[PDB]
Structure 1
Amino acid sequence: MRECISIHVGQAGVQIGNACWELYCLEHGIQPDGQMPSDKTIGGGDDSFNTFFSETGAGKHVPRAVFVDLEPTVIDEVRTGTYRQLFHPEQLITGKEDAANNYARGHYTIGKEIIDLVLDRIRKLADQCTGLQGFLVFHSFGGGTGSGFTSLLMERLSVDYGKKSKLEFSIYPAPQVSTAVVEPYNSILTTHTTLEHSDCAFMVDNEAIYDICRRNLDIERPTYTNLNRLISQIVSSITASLRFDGALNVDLTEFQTNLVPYPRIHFPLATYAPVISAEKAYHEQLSVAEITNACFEPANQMVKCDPRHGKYMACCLLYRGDVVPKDVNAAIATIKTKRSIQFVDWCPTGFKVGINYQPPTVVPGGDLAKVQRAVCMLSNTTAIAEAWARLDHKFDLMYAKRAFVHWYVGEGMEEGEFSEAREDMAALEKDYEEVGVDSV
């Protein structure tokens, strides 16, 4: 009970959804045919994993997920892939023409033609829920679908489910694997339009994941598969509290209370450790203190920024595996006396800790090593605004010449929406400056 509906929008969302659900199945002992031998409650149950999987009379466990893309080639691989049987066909929704990296096409022109069907299929999942908690929306900032249609969906979900919670996993654009020159435009437009409709958004910088793969896994040129398999690990750590339950397990919502002081300030910085190859892990067990140390090395963050040059508003540690409170408290004591951790004056400096005993799983043939214990730190730091600034600057360089703007106006958008969105980002950057100033 208190189920979560995942929504995967665009190529990035869908492919990351493939990585997450594959990982979920392995963590829960669910087979590609949806069967789970260990589940003795056939066709139902109120187990912890039932927050993410529904059950059929035939014993199949079905992700509470919807995949949506405006073109079929990406979802088609799901329809024919290893886990094709996991999803009921109606869970996989495809258009025929993509948004061509144009926010307007995803939000208006092409999006309007499929939005009703998507909501109807999302409604068919909510009707199977006894106490639906909220939504997890996986999408990219950069794509036309991931930015424009997502905004439309978030807008329409706030209407059909009032203030029921909606969480984002957003792919922040990075030049190394970027696809378009207009992504700064689409990133600003979608951030402006979803800001009022998202309760918490976890940003993932592809450059950060790109660097981590090359440095920590000695992958010379990471692919989307490399990045997604790492991203799934982080997503798993965040959602593990919802899918497993235990004596030290802390619900995501409880962390969420500490991470959002003001509604607009809902962008936590995620850091994950250990990311280590199986060749290096061999005969080198990482202790609780070692992985906790890594949470404060910026090289391990999901978003490139410097917490050292900002102020903390919250600090959460989500351990999974062989971890006990003592080792955690010991490590934190060392960290607090040895690292730069300065909080705003208006909030407590404690660290909120949660532990899941189920240990991390690795997908066969992956690059990560299986470890006894892992940790994901969620921190509300003002440094996250650096990601807005970098993007806002790139937006400003092009918009000053109205470069590429005609492609959006041609689809029905007005220059006003560009300046309206940029102004919102200006406030957001000024909001992050305000929260970090001392009191008088």
Structure 2
Amino acid sequence: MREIVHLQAGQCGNQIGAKFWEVISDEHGIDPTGTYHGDSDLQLERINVYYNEATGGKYVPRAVLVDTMDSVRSGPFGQIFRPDNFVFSVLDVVRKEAESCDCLQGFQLTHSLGGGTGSGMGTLLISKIREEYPDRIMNTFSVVPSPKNATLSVHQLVENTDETYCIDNEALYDICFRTLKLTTPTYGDLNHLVSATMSGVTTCLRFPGQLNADLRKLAVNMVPFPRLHFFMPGFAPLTSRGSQQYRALTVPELTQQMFDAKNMMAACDPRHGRYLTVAAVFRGRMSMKEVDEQMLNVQNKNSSYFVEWIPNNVKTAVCDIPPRGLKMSATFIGNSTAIQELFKRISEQFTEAESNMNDLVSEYQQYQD
């Protein structure tokens, strides 16, 4: 029984966590005034993971907004929130919700690694929560600056969270121009796409799937050594207004676009990359010889490029509940050697913190060798 405390810290994290709550609320059938819609009985069974309820069908999240906030409440789903914890104290509200909780497992903090609010206050508040709950998992979704501040920020964060997600807007832009033919990248579209990538991995926590793996299991599976934990996301069945009727939908088809290089969230190079751990989380009603056969067939096509000296270089997960609209969908997540280039550029751009970044780059080098 897993639990979640969600905090929007810093501006970009605020507007992405707003879309997070909108996405989970539409997938769970709650009118934004808070009333429940109960078309199916699977919607309310594990609403205890992200919510606590109110008297008369009203529901309210376990989320704290700390840093814009008037704009968020003026936005689409502002009315769901608790107006008593809009802090701008944080210790009192985090023990209030974490003491009203029963058995805690993990925390969803939305921030960045490039600014004066998402980085310093992010590191301060992750310290202030790890000093309070040392047995949880901090999923801290993050935005780092483009390789074409973070050195101050990351060197307590890599000790603390181990669940950050750091490639960014240049890759998002090129995804939008090429694989979507999407003419005007609005900020809200990127917030939408990151938010759906958030919600893709939160179905083993909320729904009964088939191969049920919660966040602690994901931590044990993915992270070999305690400092190699920066991960790479991506969402597979995306296409344009035209190409739908020209494409087909199968597990071998979504395997192609979850290992498509132009689809992943990375302005990086898998041709210079080597995945230590892969997880492909599927949602839908799909046969599983297709899943396992396509898994190890696409691992069979590349013996060099998936990592040597590991027999199973991949992992699949699957749930019985697809997204809205799409019959089945996939979300690929990786832990490769294709990520130290960002570290090299951000280090070529206090001094002991720089030395610790050089230590992490040499850590990738000495383990790739």
Q: TM-score range by the shorter chain?
A: over 0.9
Does 1:141 pair with 2:130?
A: no
Question: How far does the alpha carbon of each residue in 1:219-249 deviate from its partner, in whole angstroms, 9 at most, with x for none?
Answer: 3341210111111111111222222222333
Give the match for residue 353 of structure 2: 421
What pairs up with 1:12-27 in 2 under 5 angstroms? 12-27=12-27
* TM superposition shift of 1:33: 1.4
* TM superposition shift of 1:430: 0.7
TM-score, normalised relative to structure 1: 0.78
* TM superposition shift of 1:152: 0.6
Report which of the two structures shows the higher radius of gyration computed on alpha carbons: 1
Q: Which residue of the other structure, out of 366, 375, 379, is the alignment partner of 2:334?
A: 379
Give the match for residue 33 of structure 1: 33
1:191 partner SS: helix
What pairs up with 1:342-421 in 2 under 5 angstroms? 342-361=305-324, 370-393=325-348, 395=349, 417=350, 419-421=351-353
Q: Does the CA-based 8 Å contact 1:238-1:252 persist in structure 2? A: no
Q: 1:296 to 1:246 in 2, by over 3 A?
A: closer
Give the match for residue 168 of structure 1: 140
Q: Does the CA-based 8 Å contact 1:255-1:352 persist in structure 2? A: no
Q: 1:46 to 1:29 in 2, by over 3 A?
A: closer
What pairs up with 1:88-99 in 2 under 5 angstroms? 88-94=82-88
Q: Does the CA-based 8 Å contact 2:299-2:313 persist in structure 1? A: no
1:132 partner SS: coil
Q: Which amino acid aligns with 1:133?
A: Q
Q: 1:219 to 1:38 in 2, by over 3 A?
A: same
1:243 partner SS: coil
Q: 1:296 to 1:39 in 2, by over 3 A?
A: closer
- Determine the C-alpha separation between the residues in 2 that align with 1:340 and 1:21: 40
Give the match for residue 281 of structure 2: 318
* TM superposition shift of 1:283: 5.8
Give the match for residue 407 of structure 1: none
Does 1:84 pair with 2:78?
A: yes
Q: Which amino acid aligns with 2:343?
A: W
- Determine the C-alpha separation between the residues in 2 that align with 1:135 and 1:324: 33
Identity across aligned pairs (percent)? 39
* TM superposition shift of 1:53: 1.5
Q: What runs of 5+ residues in structure 2 fail to find an aligned partner?
A: none
Q: Which residue of the other structure, out of 297, 304, 307, is the alignment partner of 2:267?
A: 304
Q: Does the CA-based 8 Å contact 1:203-1:302 persist in structure 2? A: no
Query: Bigger shift: 270-279 or 83-92?
Result: 270-279
Question: How far does the alpha carbon of each residue in 1:74-120 deviate from its partner, in whole angstroms, 9 at most, with x for none?
Answer: 221122222122111124333xxxxxxxxxxxxxxxxxxxxxx1221
Q: Does the CA-based 8 Å contact 2:151-2:347 persist in structure 1? A: yes
How many correspondences in the alignment? 368
Q: 1:392 to 1:216 in 2, by over 3 A?
A: same
What pairs up with 1:3-152 in 2 under 5 angstroms? 3-38=3-38, 47-69=45-67, 74-94=68-88, 117-152=89-124
Question: How far does the alpha carbon of each residue in 1:291-340 deviate from its partner, in whole angstroms, 9 at most, with x for none?
Answer: 21122222222222122323221121100123221221232243123346
TM-score, normalised relative to structure 2: 0.92
Question: How far does the alpha carbon of each residue in 1:41-74 deviate from its partner, in whole angstroms, 9 at most, with x for none?
Answer: 9xxx9932321122223222222211112xxxx2
Q: Does the CA-based 8 Å contact 2:34-2:80 persist in structure 1? A: yes
* TM superposition shift of 1:27: 0.8
CA RMSD of aligned residues (A): 2.3
* TM superposition shift of 1:269: 1.6
1:171 partner SS: coil
- Determine the C-alpha separation between the residues in 2 that align with 1:281 and 1:343: 30
- Determine the C-alpha separation between the residues in 1 that align with 2:267 and 2:183: 20
Query: Bigger shift: 281-290 or 193-202?
Result: 281-290
Q: Which amino acid aligns with 1:194?
A: L
* TM superposition shift of 1:32: 0.5
Q: Does the CA-based 8 Å contact 1:139-1:169 persist in structure 2? A: yes
What pairs up with 1:180-191 in 2 under 5 angstroms? 186-191=149-154
Q: Does the CA-based 8 Å contact 1:298-1:304 persist in structure 2? A: no
* TM superposition shift of 1:343: 4.2
Question: How far does the alpha carbon of each residue in 1:251-279 deviate from its partner, in whole angstroms, 9 at most, with x for none?
Answer: 23322212111111011222221222344
1:196 partner SS: helix
Q: Which amino acid aligns with 1:136?
A: Q
Give the match for residue 196 of structure 2: 233
Give the match for residue 156 of structure 2: 193
Q: 1:124 to 1:273 in 2, by over 3 A?
A: same
Q: What runs of 5+ residues in structure 1 fail to find an aligned partner?
A: 95-116, 177-185, 362-369, 396-416
Q: Which amino acid aligns with 1:351?
A: V
Q: Does the CA-based 8 Å contact 1:63-1:86 persist in structure 2? A: yes
Q: 1:171 to 1:231 in 2, by over 3 A?
A: same
Q: Which amino acid aligns with 2:27?
A: E
Q: 1:46 to 1:253 in 2, by over 3 A?
A: farther
Q: Which amino acid aligns with 1:232?
A: S
Q: 1:340 to 1:272 in 2, by over 3 A?
A: farther
Q: 1:145 to 1:206 in 2, by over 3 A?
A: same
Moved over 6 A (4+): none
Higher helix share: 1
- Determine the C-alpha separation between the residues in 1 that align with 2:40 and 2:316: 32
- Determine the C-alpha separation between the residues in 2 that align with 1:220 and 1:202: 26
- Determine the C-alpha separation between the residues in 2 that align with 1:288 and 1:91: 44
